[PDB]
C-alpha cells in the first residue's frame, strides 16, 4: 500500500526534523543566556542525549517486540518524544520558564533531554522495520525501494530542520525556533494515529526472546533458527562498528574543515543583522543525498538489478565503505592543501558568532570529498538498514534494528574517543584545538588519512565477514 508507506515516510520526516532541530543548536542554547551553562557542560549534555538515543534503541526494539507491538510502541514513543520536546519551548520562553525553573535550569532540561532521547531511540528502532513491513509482502526489492525512500525522507527532514529550524533558532528566536520541532513531533504523532487505520501491524511475540534467552530438543526449529540467525548477524554488526566510528568522525571533522574554508557569505539572509548557522555546514551531506537517492532508485538500482551486480546488501555496504574511505582520502588531500594555504593567507569569517580563521580556499572544494561520502550513504547506510531488516529474525526485527543503531552509537562513541586520543600531546594531531579553537595548527590531514586507513582495514575485515556470512 502507498498510504501506509507514505504515512511512515512523513512521520519519519517529522521525527528527523524535530531531532535535528534539537541537536543542531542545543549546545549554543544552553551556553547562551539565561541558561549560562559552562563551556563543556552543554557539550556533555548533548553527548549524554545522543548516547541515550543510541543506548535505548535495543530496549526500544525489545519493548515493541515483546510487550507493546511495533505499531503501539511508536505511538507511545512519539508521545514521550512530544512530552520531552515541550520542555524546550517552555524553557526558552521567559513567560513559561518560571513553571519549569548542570546549571540553574538543569532538572527540566535534563528531563526533556532524557525523554527526547528515549523517544528518538524507540522511534528509530521501531519505525524503520515497521515501515519495511508495509511492503515486505511485495518482496525484497520493494523493501529495498522503501529503504531508499526512507533514507530520502530522513535526509529531507534533516534538510528542513538544519535549514529552517536552525536558522530560526539562531537568527530569529529560540521560542519559535524550538516550537516548530514540537509541532513536528505532534504532526508525526497525528500522522501515525491517522495512518493506524491503514498500517499493517504484526502482533507482538513476548516469548520470542525467552527462547533466545534460554540458549528434537526442547525448542522448535524456528525458535532455534532465530538464535542461529542472531549469532550470525552479531558479527556483521560488530564489523560495522569501525565504519560507524569513521563515518561519525567524518560528520564532525568535515564540518570543522568547512568552518576553516572560505565559506561564501550571503549578503541578503546571512548578512550583518543575522548569522550564518553552523548547521548549514552540516547540511551539505543531506543536500547531496536528497539528489543522490532518487538517482539511485530510478537509475542506478534498476541497472544494477538488470545486470545482476551487487544483489546482496553486504556487498553494497562494502562498496559504501570503500566510497567513504575514498572520501576520507579526498578530505585528507584537501586538508593538506588547506594547511599549506593557511600559512600566508588567513581570512576571518563569522559562523554563528564565532570568528573562524579560514584559508583562501573555496568551501566548494569539499564537493569531491562530500559527493563520495554521499555515495557512501547511498550504499553503506541504506543497505545497512536492509541488512538490519532482512537478516533479522522475523520475531525480533525491531530488537535487531535497535541493536544495529546501538552499535552505530558504540561506533560514534569509539570515534569520539579516537578523536580524543589523537588530541593528546604525545600525538598532537588535533591537540591545538582548545588553546585557540582553530584547526589551522591541527594536523587534520593526518587524522583524515588515519580515518581512511581505519576504513580500509574495516572494509577488508567486512569483506571477509560478508564472505563468511553468505558462505
Amino acid at each position: 500500500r502507498r498510504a501506509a508507506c507514505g504515512a511512515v515516510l512523513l512521520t519519519e520526516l517529522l521525527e528527523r526534523a524535530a531531532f535535528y532541530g534539537i541537536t543542531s543548536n542545543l549546545v549554543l542554547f544552553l551556553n547562551g543566556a539565561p541558561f549560562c551553562w559552562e563551556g563543556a557542560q552543554a557539550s556533555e549534555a548533548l553527548l549524554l542525549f545522543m548516547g541515550l538515543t543510541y543506548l535505548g534503541s535495543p530496549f526500544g526494539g525489545w519493548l515493541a517486540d515483546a510487550r507493546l507491538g511495533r505499531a503501539r510502541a511508536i505511538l507511545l514513543s512519539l508521545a514521550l518524544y512530544l512530552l520531552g520536546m515541550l520542555a524546550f519551548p517552555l524553557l526558552a520562553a521567559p513567560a513559561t520558564r518560571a513553571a519549569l525553573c548542570a546549571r540553574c535550569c538543569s532538572p527540566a532540561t535534563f528531563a526533556g533531554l532524557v525523554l527526547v532521547g528515549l523517544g528518538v531511540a524507540t522511534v528509530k528502532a521501531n519505525i524503520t522495520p515497521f515501515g519495511a513491513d508495509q511492503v515486505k509482502d511485495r518482496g525484497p526489492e520493494a523493501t529495498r525501494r522503501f529503504f531508499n525512500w526512507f533514507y530520502w525522507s530522513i535526509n529531507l527532514g534533516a534538510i528542513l530542520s538544519l535549514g529552517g529550524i536552525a536558522y530560526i533558532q539562531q537568527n530569529v528566536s529560540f521560542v519559535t525556533g524550538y516550537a516548530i520541532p514540537t509541532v513536528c513531533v505532534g504532526l508525526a504523532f497525528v500522522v501515525f494515529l491517522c495512518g493506524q487505520s491503514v498500517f499493517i501491524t504484526k502482533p507482538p511475540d513476548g516469548s520470542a526472546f525467552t527462547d533466545m534467552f534460554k540458549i528434537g530438543g526442547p525448542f522448535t526449529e524456528e525458535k532455534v533458527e532465530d538464535v542461529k540467525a542472531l549469532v550470525k548477524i552479531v558479527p556483521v554488526f560488530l564489523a560495522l562498528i569501525p565504519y560507524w566510528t569513521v563515518y561519525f568522525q567524518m560528520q564532525t571533522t568535515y564540518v570543522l574543515q568547512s568552518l576553516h574554508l572560505r565559506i561564501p557569505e550571503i549578503s541578503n539572509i546571512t548578512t550583518t543583522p543575522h548569522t550564518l548557522p553552523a548547521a548549514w555546514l552540516t547540511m551539505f551531506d543531506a543536500v547531496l543525498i536528497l539528489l543522490l537517492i532518487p538517482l539511485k532508485d530510478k537509475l542506478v538500482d534498476p541497472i544494477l538489478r538488470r545486470h545482476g551486480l551487487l544483489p546482496s546488501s553486504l556487498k553494497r555496504i562494502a562498496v559504501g565503505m570503500f566510497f567513504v574511505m575514498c572520501s576520507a582520502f579526498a578530505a585528507g588531500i584537501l586538508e593538506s592543501k588547506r594547511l599549506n594555504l593557511v600559512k600566508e593567507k588567513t581570512i576571518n569569517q563569522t559562523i554563528g558568532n564565532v570568528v573562524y580563521h579560514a584559508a583562501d580556499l573555496s568551501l566548494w572544494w569539499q564537493v569531491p570529498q562530500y559527493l563520495l561520502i554521499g555515495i557512501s550513504e547511498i550504499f553503506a547506510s541504506i543497505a545497512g538498514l536492509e541488512f538490519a531488516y532482512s537478516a533479522a529474525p522475523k520475531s525480533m526485527q525491531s530488537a535487531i534494528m535497535g541493536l544495529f543503531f546501538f552499535f552505530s552509537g558504540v561506533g560514534s562513541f569509539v570515534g569520539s574517543g579516537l578523536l580524543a586520543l589523537v588530541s593528546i600531546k604525545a600525538i598532537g594531531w588535533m591537540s591545538s584545538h582548545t588553546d585557540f579553537g582553530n584547526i589551522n595548527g591541527c594536523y587534520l590531514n593526518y587524522y583524515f588519512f588515519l580515518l581512511a586507513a581505519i576504513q580500509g582495514a574495516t572494509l577488508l575485515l567486512f569483506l571477509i565477514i560478508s564472505v563468511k556470512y553468505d558462505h
Partner: antibody
C-alpha cells in the same frame, strides 16, 4: 620590533588624489592583514578597509567605497591607501593598523598600529 | 554595520578608584570585542582582546567582561597612566566598528 612607519602630515588640496603610505617592517609583510583606520579630531575611530599583502584582496568598508583604494607594494613592503577627491570632511588621522591573526593564532586584534598620518585638506 | 555604542563619552575618575567603561553592541557580537587604549597623542594600543582576555603588558588591573550585546572594561586600580580614550571594537562582522570612545578624566 614590528614597525608600521607613517609619514605624518599629508597636507593636500581638495579634489586631488592622496596616497597615504605605511612602511611595514620588522615582520613578514605578506601574512597579516593591513587595515586602515580613520580618526576624526572630534569623533571616534572608523575602520576603512583591509588589504592582505599577498593577494591584495581588499575588504573595503562600504561607507568608504569609491573614496578609499587599498593597494600594496610588496617589493618595498609598503601598504598604500588612496583617497580620490578628498573633500573637507576627509581630513583626519589615518592609522595603518596591522591585524594580529594568522596560521594557528586566533589573536584577532589590531596588534601594531602606525603613528597616524594627519591628512589635512 | 554593528553600531557599537559607548553611551558615556567622558568618565571622571580619581587615582586609586575604579571606573567601568561600558559598550553596548547593536547585535549579538559574542566574545568578539577588543578594547584599545589611545593615550593622548598616540596610536591606540590593544588592551583586551576577546572582551575578556588581557594583552601582554597590561598591568592586570584593567579587566574585561561581557558577551553578546553588552561589554565592560573595568579598571579597579586607576593610576595616572590610565588617562586615555578607550575604544570598543567589534570584529564579529564586517565592517569593523569602533565605539564612540571613552576618555578617563583623572581628577
Amino acid at each position: 620590533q614590528v614597525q608600521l612607519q607613517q609619514p605624518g602630515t599629508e597636507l593636500v588640496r581638495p579634489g586631488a588624489s592622496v596616497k597615504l603610505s605605511c612602511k611595514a617592517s620588522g615582520y613578514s609583510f605578506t601574512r597579516y592583514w593591513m587595515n586602515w583606520v580613520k580618526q576624526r579630531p572630534g569623533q571616534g575611530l572608523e575602520w576603512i578597509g583591509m588589504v592582505h599583502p599577498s593577494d591584495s584582496e581588499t575588504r573595503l568598508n562600504q561607507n568608504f567605497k569609491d573614496k578609499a583604494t587599498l593597494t600594496v607594494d610588496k617589493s618595498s613592503s609598503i601598504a598604500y591607501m588612496q583617497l580620490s577627491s578628498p573633500t573637507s570632511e576627509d581630513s583626519a588621522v589615518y592609522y595603518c593598523a596591522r591585524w594580529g591573526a594568522y596560521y594557528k593564532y586566533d589573536w584577532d586584534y589590531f596588534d601594531s598600529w602606525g603613528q597616524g598620518t594627519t591628512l589635512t585638506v | 554595520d554593528i553600531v557599537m555604542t559607548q553611551s558615556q563619552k567622558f568618565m571622571s575618575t580619581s587615582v586609586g578608584d575604579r571606573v567601568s567603561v561600558t559598550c553596548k553592541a547593536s547585535q549579538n557580537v559574542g566574545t568578539n570585542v577588543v578594547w584599545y587604549q589611545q593615550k593622548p597623542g598616540q596610536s591606540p594600543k590593544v588592551l583586551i582582546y576577546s572582551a575578556s582576555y588581557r594583552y601582554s603588558g597590561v598591568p592586570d588591573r584593567i579587566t574585561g567582561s561581557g558577551s553578546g550585546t553588552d561589554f565592560t572594561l573595568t579598571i579597579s586600580n586607576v593610576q595616572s597612566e590610565d588617562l586615555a580614550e578607550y575604544f570598543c571594537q567589534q570584529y564579529n562582522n564586517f565592517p569593523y566598528t569602533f565605539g564612540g570612545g571613552t576618555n578617563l578624566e583623572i581628577k
